[PDB]
Amino acid sequence: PENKYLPELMAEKDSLDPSFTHAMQLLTAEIEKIQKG
Amino acid sequence: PENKYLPELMAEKDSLDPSFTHAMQLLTAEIEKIQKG
C-alpha cells in the first residue's frame, strides 16, 4: 500500500549510501510518483 | 546508456544491503527491464 510504502521509500532513501547512484535514483523516482499521485 | 547502465545496476544491486527492501526491489526490477528489453 502506497500510504505505508511512501515512508518506507523515504526511510530507505535517506539511509541508503549515495555511492549507489542508480539505487538512490530509483528510490527518488518512486517517491516522486507517490508524492505526485 | 543501457549497455553500461545494466552492469551498474547489477553492481549496486549486489552490493546494496538487503535491509533496503524497496531499494533492492527497484534495482532488481530495472535490471529485469534491460535484461528483457
Swiss-Prot record, chains A, B:
Recorded superkingdom: Eukaryota
Recorded consequence of changing E12A: Impairs homodimerization
Location of the protein in the cell: Nucleus; Cytoplasm; Membrane
Modification after translation, per record: Tyrosine phosphorylated by several non-receptor tyrosine kinases including LCK, FYN and JAK3. Also tyrosine phosphorylated by the non-receptor tyrosine kinase SRMS in an EGF-dependent manner. Negatively correlates with ability to bind RNA but required for many interactions with proteins. Phosphorylation by PTK6 negatively regulates its RNA binding ability. Acetylated. Positively correlates with ability to bind RNA. Deacetylated by HDAC6; this regulates alternative splicing by inhibiting the inclusion of CD44 alternate exons.
Domain comment, as recorded: The KH domain is required for binding to RNA. The Pro-rich domains are flanked by Arg/Gly-rich motifs which can be asymmetric dimethylated on arginine residues to give the DMA/Gly-rich regions. Selective methylation on these motifs can modulate protein-protein interactions.
Assembly description: Self-associates to form homooligomers when bound to RNA, oligomerization appears to be limited when binding to proteins; dimerization increases RNA affinity. Forms a trimeric complex in the nucleus consisting of BANP, HDAC6 and KHDRBS1/SAM68; HDAC6 keeps KHDRBS1 in a deacetylated state which inhibits the inclusion of CD44 alternate exons. The complex is disrupted by MAPK1/MAPK3-mediated phosphorylation of BANP which results in BANP export to the cytoplasm. This facilitates acetylation of KHDRBS1 and CD44 variant exon inclusion. Interacts with KHDRBS3/SLIM-2.
The name this protein goes by in its record: KH domain-containing, RNA-binding, signal transduction-associated protein 1
Encoding gene (name): KHDRBS1
Whole sequence portion shown: 99 to 135 of 443
